[PDB]
């Protein structure tokens with residue numbers, strides 16, 4: 001059964017609702033981005049219209065084998081009519097191809113669905129600047145004041161400087177970066193760039209990255225592991241056992257591993273500044289956890305909502321417990337009383 005927060009009232013539309021079978025009354029299924037909790041249920045046998053970005057469409061065709069006749073890519077920042085309703089796709093500042101969706105209902109109501117997003121002041125000068133938004137379907141992943149983390153730029157500076165120092169001290173060190181989905185590509189791309197290397201990876205990950213429209217990508221990535229001193233591995237292998245095993249496979253080319261685990265928020269954010277971050281070390285292997293987020297911090301979320309001034313907010317994350325729902329509702333009321341809407 002499809003939950004209420006994935007339905008758009010006054011339309012035949014659902015958002016990120018592919019795991020519920022045939023949804024009664026749904027004439028078009030929107031997909032905000034290619035993450036598995038959101039696409040769960042899509043396959044080569046799906047036969048309803050899917051609306052999404054160009055990049056998400058490339059991934060549906062090549063990774064999930066969805067037939068081309070059912071994929072409806074839409075350009076960004078452009079008014080489009082879908083089944084008689086005006087819609088606009090906006091960049092969500094999440095992973096590649098991720099969008100927010102503006103729906104202009106026939107009755108005059110305007111709804112914004114953020115999908116997954118990292119709010120930014122640059123959104124205050126998109127097509128959102130024009131008109132009023134009545135209902136907001138909000139990515140509330142980190143909707144609590146304890147969730148603080150640095151800018152993406154600060155985290156990348158730390159990673160580049162750490163990697164460059166380690167490999168300049170020891171030219172026989174290998175750098176490894178963990179991954180389990182699309183997103184956070186800047187971490188491994190920026191490190192490879194400072195080291196003058198391509199990024200080496202499996203055939204399967206190479207395929208995924210070739211779908212993302214990244215400029216000059218053929219110059220940056222490879223399946224030839226022997227040519228590369230920055231390797232990508234599954235996130236599950238970023239531990240002392242898995243990294244030791246990987247080092248064995250490299251044939252005595254390297255004598256040290258420096259590894260990065262790009263997490264979201266972790267409790268050590270409450271204590272430590274990005275500059276003060278230290279690795280876990282065993283012998284010739286060091287592992288850094290770095291807080292590279294593709295979701296809004298609490299303060300970023302608050303600023304966006306107080307600017308937008310929506311009449312009603314519908315959370316799409318942390319909806320499963322009464323304590324979470326009550327906590328989020330108290331913050332939304334605080335924000336409204338402070339700003340005066």
Ligand SMILES: CC1(C)C[C@@H](NCc2ccc(O)cc2)CCO1
Nearest residue numbers: 090091092093122123125126127
């Ligand atoms: C050069 C600028 C500043 C213009 C900006 N265009 C509008 C926009 C802003 C934010 C969005 O999330 C979506 C669209 C994108 C790139 O950066």
Ligand code: NI
Nearest residue numbers: 033035094116
């Ligand atoms: Ni996501």
